Amino acid sequence: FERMENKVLDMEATSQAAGELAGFGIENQFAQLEASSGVEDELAALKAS
């Protein structure tokens, strides 16, 4: 029975990939990266004052 519940673990693993069939992936989170690196750049430029 526990092993069947591990197949629910495989279902959640499927579900985290599933956004890609909906056209969501790393290309979305990549924006927050390009942004957050820019946030560190401007906070560094501020503290350089």
Binding site: D10, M11, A17, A18, E20
Partner: protein, 110 residues
Amino acid sequence: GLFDRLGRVVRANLNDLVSKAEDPEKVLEQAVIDMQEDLVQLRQAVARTIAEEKRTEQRLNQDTQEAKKWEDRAKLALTNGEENLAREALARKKSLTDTAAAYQTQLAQQ
């Protein structure tokens, strides 16, 4: 009789009246919304497919580290001078290593 082939052309008169309405998009929408409900299950099916692929992949990872454990208990045996236990561990790993190869082929098709 000819009246049946006439039946196609009088239904084509109706088809002319409804074509003259010219609001085509409405069925385009119908088509794409029906496929969206399927698509969420379809991506789920892809995910299930990947999930068997993964459950197998972690298994193969678990196998290949367990194969090292038998080789490690064999290294202990070899360095101790316990070759009988090294050969027991040698049987265990070979059995595992071939099952690992089977899972590798199962993943390859997956």
